[PDB]
Nucleic acid binder design. Structure first.
Lengths: 61, 100, 48, 72
RNA sequence: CAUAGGCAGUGUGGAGGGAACGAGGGGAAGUGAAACAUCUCAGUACCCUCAGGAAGAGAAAACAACCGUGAUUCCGGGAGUA
RNA sequence: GUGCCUUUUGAAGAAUGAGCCUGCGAGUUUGCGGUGCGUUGCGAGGUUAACCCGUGUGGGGAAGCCGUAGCGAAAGCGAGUCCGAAUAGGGCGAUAGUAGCGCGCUCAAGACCCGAAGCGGAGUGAUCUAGCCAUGGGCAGGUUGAGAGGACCGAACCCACCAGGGUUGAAAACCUGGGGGAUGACCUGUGGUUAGGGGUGAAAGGCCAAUCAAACUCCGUGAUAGCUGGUUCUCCCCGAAAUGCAUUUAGGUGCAGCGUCGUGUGUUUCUUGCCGGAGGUAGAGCACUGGAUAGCCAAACUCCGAAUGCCGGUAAGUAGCGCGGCAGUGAGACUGUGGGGGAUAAGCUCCAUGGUCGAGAGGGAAACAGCCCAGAGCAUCGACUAAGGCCCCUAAGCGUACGCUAAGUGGGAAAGGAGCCGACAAUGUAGCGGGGCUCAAGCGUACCGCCGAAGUCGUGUCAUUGCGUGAUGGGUAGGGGAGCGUCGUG
RNA sequence: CAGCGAGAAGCGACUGUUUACUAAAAACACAGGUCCGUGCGAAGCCGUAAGGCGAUGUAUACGGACUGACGCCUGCCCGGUGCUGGAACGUUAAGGGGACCGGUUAGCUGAGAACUUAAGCGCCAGUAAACGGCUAAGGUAGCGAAAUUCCUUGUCGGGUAAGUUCCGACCUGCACGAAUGGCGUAACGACUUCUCGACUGUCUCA
RNA sequence: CAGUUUGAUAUUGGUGUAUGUCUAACCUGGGUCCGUGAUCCGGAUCAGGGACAGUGUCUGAUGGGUAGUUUAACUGGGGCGGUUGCCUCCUAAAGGGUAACGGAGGCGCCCAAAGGUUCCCUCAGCCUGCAGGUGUUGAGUGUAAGUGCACAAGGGAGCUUGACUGUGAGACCGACGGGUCGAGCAGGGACGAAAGUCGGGACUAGUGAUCCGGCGGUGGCUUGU
């Protein structure tokens, strides 16, 4: 059997069309000086670059 | 999983949000468009009969969903039904009887 | 010298905003009015 | 004690004259107002010039000062 | 007193050997982590006691979930999932 | 007409490896693993695992797994769903799969093969050597004189200060001549004993079986190498890189750039003309700031300011893009141009922009990867040319005409002095490739012709590709395709 | 067959041991000196333990550390580190304790403060033949271009025809110095350095 | 980590005022006797020590005696010295980008106003005796340089807290993670009559990914209920 990379299975999710999505980094602390718009720009899920998605797709089974 | 020392992709993006439910159950769902082709003359629609027509896995909970249109009367006996599907069935003269 | 304060009004008792304020310049507990999203009003948020 | 620099910012004009743009595109990135906003052009927080309405970009001199203009 | 000990009589009692397999104990490092100490390698190598033709386990102070299954062992799943 | 391989910017290289032949020696295997392609069966379904029956490769077996609906942290809702007070705006979804077989890549296993110093477990070693313990043996001869002596001279015995020899030796430590102790802390025989992070040590990290800053053997074990070497048959088509970011990072690797194949698109690419744009370089100038005796200077001065280049539109003429499989590259070199560091150096070093080499044969520069000409499918005892040449070496002009040079200048050089001087290193002419050349075979300017390559044309022939015809066929790393040969099976 | 001799300096007292196989020495050892530990089931050491050596010994004995015959001597510093002794008082673990606050529907149960305590440390004295230095104190005696002195072939004297070596002094000790001992020392040395006589193929020169 | 060492606790008892005493656990490498021909061992018995010591578990201190390993890179060889992230200028060859241990400097903040809005004003320098004339940018712009700012973004007053909550059409720059601008809409507000502006500061530096954990809020959920 394959073992899926335990770390990556916790950070990426696959959609209904096979896209691989991430959460934005930088919204855990030092949130005082970050204006409201920056926090919004870091909300939600963002699609991956093609090269990055290829490696994750190929390391997560 | 190695980017030449630079922090790996899988180690600088935050973990996914939330927890997971150990007891969540998913229904096998049948849309009205593909349920009006299995019964082109109406009639009663049981779960164990839906299995024999290759519309839902065996040994699960069925839940008719409301995509499409139904033109004939169906007496569906399933585990659940969505609001739009229930309206569409009733409009076509059918009756929806849930088990759950 | 300039610490991070947490503003709060007298109704929602939810910490909405945080800001910088020079201690020695404004030793008195700072205060102003903001938009509390719980209250949905322009109430006054006294510094915690 | 030399040998320090700030990495490049890629300033400059991003849409030139005669270039068709959609509302909100960046036309110029600049420090200060080397070009002022004209008809249909807005100023951002950091002097960025962006189109307010779709059209063609056109430079000119309105009221004795270089401006950018969007011609529907 | 008495025991320790000594003497006499017997025992198809034990001792050591053996390719692999087994149960219970002790227990590394090279290696991986592109360094390294938590961690891995690995309860592996090796060592100790005891076996049998197999060993161990095994007849619920067990599961499950309000419905129910009914000693243990082994194989394929569940699943590289929680 | 300067070997083969490897490694290099670059090797005949005086860089590594190979004395020779014969035989052996490096991309494998597993999996109802992951992934992409091709093919086959069935197809809204596809398919079994364990296991059961059978002589076999045959039949059964639906536990499961993949497809069938998604969104959300989840409750949950569901062609929607989540953020949201929102019938605001958005993110994610809505408008033929599966099972074998073959191939490429990949995961875990020694995983393409070879190669350490060392680490750990269990044992073997004090017959050599270092200590100590028991019991025996040895010290010719002569002196000194408290007949004592860690006394004197000196053979045996023990040792190894000097020199020469030996140095693939007679000897893996010795020989010859000298030399030290030679009744003592001495030498020696036999028997015991101390064992590896341990012994022993009048202490040198010395000795512990020719091995010691941690012995030897077996086992873990096919240890680990960001490192070095090796990796074997052929042809056809295409064909790079030595760059950017980051890096416990710099000789490694991840992503991007550049290659190839499949699939979809089809002129979207590129070149030139024209058209619409922003600029602050070269140049120039002092209007600002500074330097400075009306004249001047300036990367961080600009009243000015091109040529080019860049962005978009359009016309004409002849590769581009999306999605996937597989890479290598990430040490560059010289030369032209614009610069920095350096000293108005370097075959120096760091950038930008071309060329060639790298990976490029052929012709020229005498030889001379990077310069000039030119891009090799194959054959040709035909022709015309390119750079460069036409007195002989050596193919073609002792060419025609005018003028200059007297220095063998041509066939190396400065300030400076009146083509000349200045001019000047070491094996042998040696600063035209050589002979020789002014009766130019030297330089200048015209005119005529010829030689000259694997270039082009002519002739014959094969192959890739698009629609008989057009284009195309150098090639290293690398990608794809088609095959030769050996052994075995039906 | 069978000693060459003499004068002087350096180091080490001496005889001895040492890097089997490039170093035999100024290195190690030594007799002597000091300090430290040990009251005997000693201290110290091998061993998990038993058990052993120490020792069939007993403070004039045994072990550890440094110096290294003998002669004259061994100066100042206890601030640092270590060692010895004292611990009033501060801090401090386990253990004891269970204030008070919670969960559940008095009981069970979770977390758990105050307070109690030893060594150790902070603190106070001594100690340098303890590691060390010369403000804690700033190198005394002795020696000094030296196994130490870069500048350096220092300067002066002697030796030679000529002396970067050598001997005796000076003292500007880059960067001597008192038991990691200072300065000397008769004898000894296959040790290092300089000089002289005998002698010679070492050499002129073969 | 071994070793040394402190305390609690078990072995561990009686009795009196942290400290005495007693004997019976326990210790004698003290004497004598037996197994016994016996310096080991054990059992007697006298002589002492004594609930101490030794030992087990828990615990503080010390611990190169031992053991496992770390001890960065760049670099005109290496060491020494210097530097490592961000912002501005020049090199940089008139888009963008572009190297050197190339040439100059700054940052790790500050302001409750030095933010928002409405309204109003123009400076430096020079000349004359606070006043007058002149003065268009040579002053100022919190903080380095540059691009701007005189229409002010410079100076002065009134009112205020948008230094917001829910969003992001469309774009710029990066290999990527990421960095930056942003129309319009809704809520609920400030200023202005109004148009309108306000999602900090004239702009560009004033900062740090994930993991782990703390605090406040909300009520979504995890093993029978």
């Amino acid at each position: 059997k394959n073992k899926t990379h335990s770390g990556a299975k916790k950070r990426f999710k696959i959609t209904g069309s096979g896209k691989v999505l991430r959460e934005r980094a930088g919204k855990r602390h030092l949130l005082e000086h970050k204006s409201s718009k920056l926090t919004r720009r870091l909300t939600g899920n963002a699609e991956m670059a093609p090269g990055d998605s290829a490696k994750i797709k190929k390391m997560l089974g | 999983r190695f980017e030449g020392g630079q922090m790996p992709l899988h180690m600088r993006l935050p973990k996914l949000k939330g927890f997971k439910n150990p007891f969540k159950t998913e229904y096998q769902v049948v849309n009205l468009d593909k349920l009006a082709s299995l019964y082109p003359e109406g009639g009663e629609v049981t779960v164990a009969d839906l299995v024999a027509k290759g519309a839902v896995r065996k040994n699960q909970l069925v839940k008719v969903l409301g995509q499409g249109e139904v033109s004939v009367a169906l007496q569906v006996t399933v585990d659940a039904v969505s609001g739009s599907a229930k309206e569409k069935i009733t409009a076509a003269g059918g009756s929806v009887t849930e088990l759950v | 010298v300039r610490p991070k304060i947490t503003l709060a009004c007298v109704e929602c008792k939810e910490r909405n905003y945080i800001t910088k304020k020079n201690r020695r310049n404004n030793p008195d507990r700072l205060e102003m009015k903001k938009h509390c999203p719980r209250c949905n009003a322009h109430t006054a948020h006294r510094e915690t | 004690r030399n040998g320090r620099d700030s990495n490049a910012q890629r300033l400059g004009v991003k849409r030139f004259g005669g270039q068709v743009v959609n509302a909100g595109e960046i036309l110029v990135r600049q420090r200060g107002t080397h070009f002022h906003p004209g008809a249909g052009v807005g100023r951002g927080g950091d002097d960025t010039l962006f189109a307010l309405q779709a059209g063609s970009v056109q430079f000119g001199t309105f009221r004795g000062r270089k401006v950018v203009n969007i011609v529907p």
